[PDB]
């Protein structure tokens, strides 16, 4: 997995 367990992955394509 690349989409790390941030609360808000700002500036990523993980939305």
């Amino acid at each position, epitope marked *: *997995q690349k989409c*790390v367990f941030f*609360a808000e*992955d*700002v500036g*990523s394509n993980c939305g």
Partner: antibody
Amino acid sequence: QVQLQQPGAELVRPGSSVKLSCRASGYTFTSYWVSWVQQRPGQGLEWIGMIHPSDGEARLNQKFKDKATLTVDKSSTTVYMQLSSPTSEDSAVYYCALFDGYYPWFASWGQGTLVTVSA
Amino acid sequence: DIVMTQSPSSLALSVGQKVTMNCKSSQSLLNSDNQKNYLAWYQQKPGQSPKLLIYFASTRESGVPDRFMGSGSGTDFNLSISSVQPEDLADYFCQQHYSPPLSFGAGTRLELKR
């Protein structure tokens, strides 16, 4: 257990690029991000960026966007960070670190490489 | 970017004392989804690399003595030690793991009183 092998020190000449090494073991290298962290002498920690060895995708802290370049070598499970046009301001300890799984805090660190900038 | 402010910058203490460190963030680190605060704490002994103590504000990493205590919520957080041991004399840094870029505080240093 997880291991991150860094050299203790590195000498770099001003304006001359340096390639820092961090060899990873003890986990699936192609599944997790490897971060780089700067610690100026006496100062705190500052996140530079990370690279994913799956395909070598990298995400940088915009403050180091034009400063650092991250590369991977999957044959030797090693991650590299390069500093362009380095000055004495870049003399610091550089750590590579690994997230706690997919949780964005650092459960594993390398010993840190002390980079001395001098011609 | 989220800015982290630690205080105080240094503390002189005696072995056995309780101690408290403060870490403030420029915005809330509380995720409403799971009601958890996204802050971590690290210990760095001189010449050593950082070592993870606490994550989610109050959860200890395995192998961390329970004299280390993380508390706080939103934008205000503390790290306390119930009985400061000699090996606890080190630097301590907080980090927000809420959103990138990951940011730390400048740190607090514990030192022996005399």
